[PDB]
Structures are given as structure tokens and as C-alpha cells.
Design a protein that fits this description.
The protein is mostly loops. It has no helices and no strands. This is U1 small nuclear ribonucleoprotein 70 kDa.
């Protein structure tokens, strides 16, 4: 899952798994 996205670039790079990182 994600915790805190923006959108795609700024939100989920490595941020795909945001909870962790």
C-alpha cells in the first residue's frame, strides 16, 4: 500500500511502498 502520495513522480517512485519509505 501507500501512506502519503502526491501523484506518480513526487508521490510514488520508491514511494510505492510509502509506509516504509
Amino acid at each position: 500500500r501507500i501512506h502519503m502520495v502526491y501523484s506518480k513522480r513526487s508521490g510514488k517512485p520508491r514511494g510505492y511502498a510509502f509506509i516504509e519509505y
